[model samples]
Target: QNPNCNIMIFHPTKEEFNDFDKYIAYMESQGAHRAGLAKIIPPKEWKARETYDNISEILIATPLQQVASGRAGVFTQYHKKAAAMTVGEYRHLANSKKYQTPPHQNFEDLERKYWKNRIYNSPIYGADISGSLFDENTKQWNLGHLGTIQDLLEKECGVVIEGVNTPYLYFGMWKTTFAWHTEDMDLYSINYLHLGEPKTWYVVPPEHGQRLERLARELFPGSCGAFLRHKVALISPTVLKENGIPFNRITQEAGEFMVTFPYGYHAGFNHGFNCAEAINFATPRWIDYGKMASQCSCGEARVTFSMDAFVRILQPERYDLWKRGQD
Candidate 1:
């Protein structure tokens, strides 16, 4: 019985990635929803890492105005109770207003205040932590294959990690939710709770993904509907269960992580004010799903993913395998 029988908890015997391959193999074989930490720590090389217990302070110290206003950076603000404006209009507001508001409290201060009071979710920009945080060791990035392949691609194919291209930070308060969806390109995603309140996740395996999509489309028809506009479907776990579909649920806390496999459908809401870092990744096993994901229609524009170049460079035989399966 694997720990990932729905969800599993793992504690590293050592303080490193020594057992990473073993963990990955187990997750794949069992078709597990997620695996995570009993305890996790940033490397000593990651000296810039703020104390996990004090992550909120670190977040508050970062200049929200400057970070959110950068050409590559964006922020998402919600209505007092629900996700109203999409991240685009929120970005425009932040940019045009320099992330400022009418009150003496700047946008960051208001965000912090609102979070403390359970009012809204705040946003920070760029993928991965800024500066040289991950410069010392690639293993610091715990997402799929990132520890092994990120630098390799950079060196081998002149690929450079860019904003919205890799891991991004999510700062959330109570009810700050990510709606139902799969990772872009059907790639795998690994999310680590760097600190704070737990984030609850509802996961449906790849086997039920198409069924779930059909259900959503049937429930809310049109490209401008809720499911389509927000990239979030309204279907709940209860609804899916009532309909005879299977799903797994877990709540990720500080030091724990969650891994969603390729094409796995997932959605969740934060339990309280918290911070989490998430990134997308692909492996040799993902090539087939990546191809299918490229053809998926969710009423949204597609993105150019590194899956193609990464596979071509790292696993040339994947093309042949994909063709064989196609035939």
Candidate 2:
């Protein structure tokens, strides 16, 4: 019933999604990951992403050398290699007064000038592409730099979109980087990530999800059907219990994982120590477009979502609902 692709694993494909390979090569040139593509390894000790298909998720490893104490992920896309340029260099360019000059002042200049804002939102740094920044441990930054759904709606598709604060997913490592958590009810679905390595996931299945009261987590304050569970760690196949339950696994960059609220009880472990992880929760602007859409989406089944809700308003109550007549 689900027309959406549910790849339970990360299958590496040579086909470039958003030109990831080119991006990685630049990263390697810049000495970022020591390699462009994030490495993902399954419990079988097999690097499954490079040779398989139907991959829907990926876990990329991020080392401490690449990260700092206060920061989480990259903000710029170009990994300056060979003749690389540093943020310090860009700062000079920005303050150069002549930054508004030719080439530097092109439409891309708008992105360069406004990237910090984009980095705070799901705004992609580059147009039709993603830009990233390296996590330098010796820097100072704000915690939780992520943006709400409002940040995702860019007037120009060419405008750089940004990504906010998120969990780390290590490359080449399949360790769990995230644990039990829930998205704001306004978010309908998302694309999950394991920064450095691939991850082993344990999702509360549909039927099990339906018995919310049995799970007893107060799915809602007063209503039933809110299945809640504590976050679990992602361990190796040998290290984990072989309870014969099939938990979904992910390990590739181009891979995607669609999620919903009630189906939100999930967890993963990174394959190695000191890595990065992230996820982009991009619920569709128009959710009722197809049959079995929810089946392919996230959270628990039958959990109600408002058709007109905008995820950007993290706290709907904070908005001027009275002006809209809902108040």
Candidate 3:
């Protein structure tokens, strides 16, 4: 597999720290998107503490399931008809025998009964850590293992990748689909399956980004249409493979971590009821993608962070350094 254009999985040994700093270093060194389940000492403790049951105690004790649900957030597509609504709105509609009759199961029940997924797309505080149950797991690490690298980038490069702090919590059941798309600004992203069912991921290499986009526009005409201006395209993996597009499949499980590189196109769904936390990160590694990234904002083509605006936001000293490098 091409080093920067492939996906790899690792199973760490006892030598690796509980926080998995070593694995993070390993992933960066590999220079590709990778996922792995670690073999830390006292395996039972890690397994028991990190499972769906334990985490639910602290975070799900309240109406967290309802409260966290995004307003006009949940998007659904069945047989080419797509709709967007709040979690409760979808739940009520799906539960009603009138609307949720046969053949229209909606993946809605699974979303409600098994999956308690929620997305907080905007930047927020207190979520930087993976809740209290696994709090100790991030104790020794700074910004926790999740943000430590991104934090380092900000410190060293003096360019803060906005939204790095906003994490997405996916509590899902079987077949909850995340349509195919890339991270905004071509920033890197890491998703940690805090507990429960494995998520299936399909990833396309960077070189095929335009190809994938073209295929999406061609096949999914409705969503990819000019008037609607949707950035995400729901393409079939089987079709892409048949066309000779190279990609990889991964099942990210409990205690496992998955990383997606800049410009990688990926989509997947949960295997069963599970909870996962994910956030975006960008380093100087992404500065090069700034222009293209700005041009390709998912769904809206909105300028995420224009190259000029990004430079303007940097500290004066770093700005000068950037200018000198350009010269």
Regions of candidate 2 where Cα sits further than 4 Å from its true position = 2-16, 19-177, 186-198, 205-208, 216-262, 285-326
List per-prediction Cα lDDT, in the order shown.
0.50, 0.29, 0.50
TM-score of each: 0.63, 0.33, 0.60
Tell me the spans in candidate 1 whose CA falls farther than 4 Å from its real position: 1-5, 19-22, 30-145, 150-165, 224-230, 294-299, 315-327
TM-score of 3: 0.60
Clashes of 3: 1
Choose 1 or 2, whichever is better by TM-score: 1
Deviation (Å) of 178 in candidate 1: 0.6
Decreasing lDDT order of the candidates: 1, 3, 2
CA shift of 233, model 2, Å: 11
Model 2 lDDT, full chain set: 0.29
Cα lDDT tens digits for candidate 3, 75-159:
3332222233333343343335432322326444533422233332110111223332345444432123454444544555566
Preferred candidate (lDDT higher): 2 or 3: 3
